Amino acid sequence: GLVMDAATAVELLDAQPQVWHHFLGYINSMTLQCALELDIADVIHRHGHPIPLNQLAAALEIPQTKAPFLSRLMRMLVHLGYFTQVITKPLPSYWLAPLSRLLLKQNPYNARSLTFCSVHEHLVDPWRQMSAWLRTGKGKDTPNAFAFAHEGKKVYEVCSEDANFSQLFSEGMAGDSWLFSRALVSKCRDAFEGLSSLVDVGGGTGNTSKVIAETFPNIHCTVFDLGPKQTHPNLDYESGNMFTDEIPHADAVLFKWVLCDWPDEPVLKMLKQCKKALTVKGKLMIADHVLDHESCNDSNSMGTSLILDMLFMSFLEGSLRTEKQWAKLFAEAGFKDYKITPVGGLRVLIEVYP
Amino acid sequence: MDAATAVELLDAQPQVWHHFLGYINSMTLQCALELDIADVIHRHGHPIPLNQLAAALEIPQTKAPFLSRLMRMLVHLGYFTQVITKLPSYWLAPLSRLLLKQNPYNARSLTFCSVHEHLVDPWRQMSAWLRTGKEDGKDTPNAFAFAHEGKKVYEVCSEDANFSQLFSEGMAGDSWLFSRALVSKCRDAFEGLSSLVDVGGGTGNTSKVIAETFPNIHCTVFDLPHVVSGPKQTHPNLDYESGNMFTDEIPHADAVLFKWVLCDWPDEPVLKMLKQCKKALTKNGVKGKLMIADHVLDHESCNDSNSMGTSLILDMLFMSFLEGSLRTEKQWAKLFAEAGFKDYKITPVGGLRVLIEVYP
Numbered sequence A: 001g002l003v004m005d006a007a008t009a010v011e012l013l014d015a016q017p018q019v020w021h022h023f024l025g026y027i028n029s030m031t032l033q034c035a036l037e038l039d040i041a042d043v044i045h046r047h048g049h050p051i052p053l054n055q056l057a058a059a060l061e062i063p064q065t066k067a068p069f070l071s072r073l074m075r076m077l078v079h080l081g082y083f084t085q086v087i088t089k090p091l092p093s094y095w096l097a098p099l100s101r102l103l104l105k106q107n108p109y110n111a112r113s114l115t116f117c118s119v120h121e122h123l124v125d126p127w128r129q130m131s132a133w134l135r136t137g138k139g140k141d142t143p144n145a146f147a148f149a150h151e152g153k154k155v156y157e158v159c160s161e162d163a164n165f166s167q168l169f170s171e172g173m174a175g176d177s178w179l180f181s182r183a184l185v186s187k188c189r190d191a192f193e194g195l196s197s198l199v200d201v202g203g204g205t206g207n208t209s210k211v212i213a214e215t216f217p218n219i220h221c222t223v224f225d226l227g228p229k230q231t232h233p234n235l236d237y238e239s240g241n242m243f244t245d246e247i248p249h250a251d252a253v254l255f256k257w258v259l260c261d262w263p264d265e266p267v268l269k270m271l272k273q274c275k276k277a278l279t280v281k282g283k284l285m286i287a288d289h290v291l292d293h294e295s296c297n298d299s300n301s302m303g304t305s306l307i308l309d310m311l312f313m314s315f316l317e318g319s320l321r322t323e324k325q326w327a328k329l330f331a332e333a334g335f336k337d338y339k340i341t342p343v344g345g346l347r348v349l350i351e352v353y354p
Numbered sequence B: 001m002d003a004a005t006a007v008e009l010l011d012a013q014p015q016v017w018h019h020f021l022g023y024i025n026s027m028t029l030q031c032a033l034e035l036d037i038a039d040v041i042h043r044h045g046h047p048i049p050l051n052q053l054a055a056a057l058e059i060p061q062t063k064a065p066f067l068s069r070l071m072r073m074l075v076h077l078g079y080f081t082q083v084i085t086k087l088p089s090y091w092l093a094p095l096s097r098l099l100l101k102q103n104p105y106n107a108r109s110l111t112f113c114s115v116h117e118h119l120v121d122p123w124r125q126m127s128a129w130l131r132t133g134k135e136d137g138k139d140t141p142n143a144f145a146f147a148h149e150g151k152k153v154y155e156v157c158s159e160d161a162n163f164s165q166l167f168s169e170g171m172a173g174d175s176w177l178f179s180r181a182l183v184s185k186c187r188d189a190f191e192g193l194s195s196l197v198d199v200g201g202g203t204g205n206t207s208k209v210i211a212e213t214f215p216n217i218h219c220t221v222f223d224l225p226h227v228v229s230g231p232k233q234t235h236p237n238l239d240y241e242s243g244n245m246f247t248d249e250i251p252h253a254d255a256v257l258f259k260w261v262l263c264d265w266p267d268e269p270v271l272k273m274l275k276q277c278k279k280a281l282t283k284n285g286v287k288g289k290l291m292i293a294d295h296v297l298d299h300e301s302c303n304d305s306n307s308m309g310t311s312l313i314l315d316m317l318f319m320s321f322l323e324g325s326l327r328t329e330k331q332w333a334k335l336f337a338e339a340g341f342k343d344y345k346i347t348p349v350g351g352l353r354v355l356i357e358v359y360p
Ligand SMILES: Nc1ncnc2c1ncn2[C@@H]1O[C@H](CSCC[C@H](N)C(=O)O)[C@@H](O)[C@H]1O
Pocket: B154, B171, B172, B174, B175, B199, B200, B201, B202, B203, B206, B222, B223, B224, B227, B243, B244, B245, B246, B258, B259, B260, B261, B264
């Protein structure tokens, strides 16, 4: 259509890049995904020492004519903290920074699958219909934007149609469990002392329970859930629906990154069922986010937590709860006391006593 | 692996999530613009409760809890504030000046342009493009063209007036602010000029401010026909000429200005054009000057970690959809030398950018 003092103009001019940085956030996603697609971290690691740009391009099957673009991509990734670069000719050479441990294929805790899963069309595309879903009232409505953009299908049904996407999700969860469980049994050692049995609800391939069982040789761990499963003498598996099937009895019931996927109604119903079972008393163990906890209250951590809340809002049916929200559920479910112990990775352990 | 190493890696993991979940920032901001949140709150005139805000955005009351969560995200990003009254009430933060429709410097169009399918999608073919040789005939100058059946962006703009309008409006909004900073912080750069050609000057926001601030300077914006045939800034000492800077003669002037233009293009055509400017700027023994309003990637004014992060993000954006980069001082100085220039001066302006005066 048709078509301020200097100090104010400069201030506003200088404020723009903060906005650009926000709306160009997808550039971080896509640059990281490229690094993974190209196996950059692995190729550098295989080299065994800093690798010159030309040799890196060659190993990546990037034409020498495009090495300058590879160089710019590396500069971005160095800034993100994955790699380092130096110029040994008076021609950059690249090596690994500590954050790259999380990209290496050889590490069972690498984040490759979660990355591919997270930036997949399945999870990004629905956001272009988020405004419409938000404005949809109650027969065109769906539980979330994901379903809104997948003809009514929630993520679990889409997982059953898309084996690759499903595999990425599971591998991504398994990778996190590898690291989280090792931090959990160390940071929260006292929470496992005294137990003879634990049920790991949504425990999947048993990565969490394997570590508990190996660390605390007297705990009989049972994974209760809907690749080959981890083996341990004190680790077994039971098939079931946590919402509509009865949870096996044990000294402790564990929910690792599970309750965050669901809204208060089905969570409360399940907790009430857990309170009945756990009562001689056992205890509830929740390894998950307490959004406003002191241990993750710094702005960087809060930013990432809130980003997860948005991610979950779009494709799951849960959220990252505050202590107040958790405490209300515990109270309503009939539990009497809880104790929070920080673990790491934005998450804590909540022990809840019936 | 000992426990301490496991905890350290577990605590480093969220940095990675934050990286790959970057698009959530993009999409939450775009939602805020789609929903007109800033404008609706501003029009309300004072902090607005959650339930009233839902109604004002035509979000059903049953979806208010989701709106609350989106606002919590946007408050953290710094666009809005939550005002404590004892439901949450919401108000505007300083950053929201850049979202309001009534401000001629708002960043709405640039945001929509930037997160558009045209610019996001080619990234899913970046690895394939990087691995493409100039032999099997599938090569293109960048991933954008690779993903657009060989079409480059300024071609897509001449054919797609909507996306094109987003991009030119986006540039205009920045120019509105940048030009006001420029004439203030670099006032001396305009001394003694009687003419200036703003090459790729768009819809004239830059030259309009130059012309008003420096009455002796006749300003000519030189851009493509589809950019300067519509509404644009007007002034008695400002006019527009159309053409292609690579194939047509640039208008003669005491100063040649490139604002956010040289960064779109690779060294070879940039050098050729700078050589042309050096010749033009030294005709008949009299010397003009070259002015570049652009990124100097390693300049002190944008050397901090946050600024550098945004510069490199732009370098990536430009790599995908343009044919240029954010050049370091080393890269610029080499071009100046090869083009035949004899001196330069760099003065910071703002928004990651500087003025380079280049003298023949
Ligand atoms: N071949 C060409 N000849 C002249 N202008 C061109 C061109 N190719 C692209 N452009 C123009 O260069 C500009 C780049 S974006 C910069 C616009 C303006 N200087 C500003 O800073 O706000 C666009 O207006 C685009 O239309």
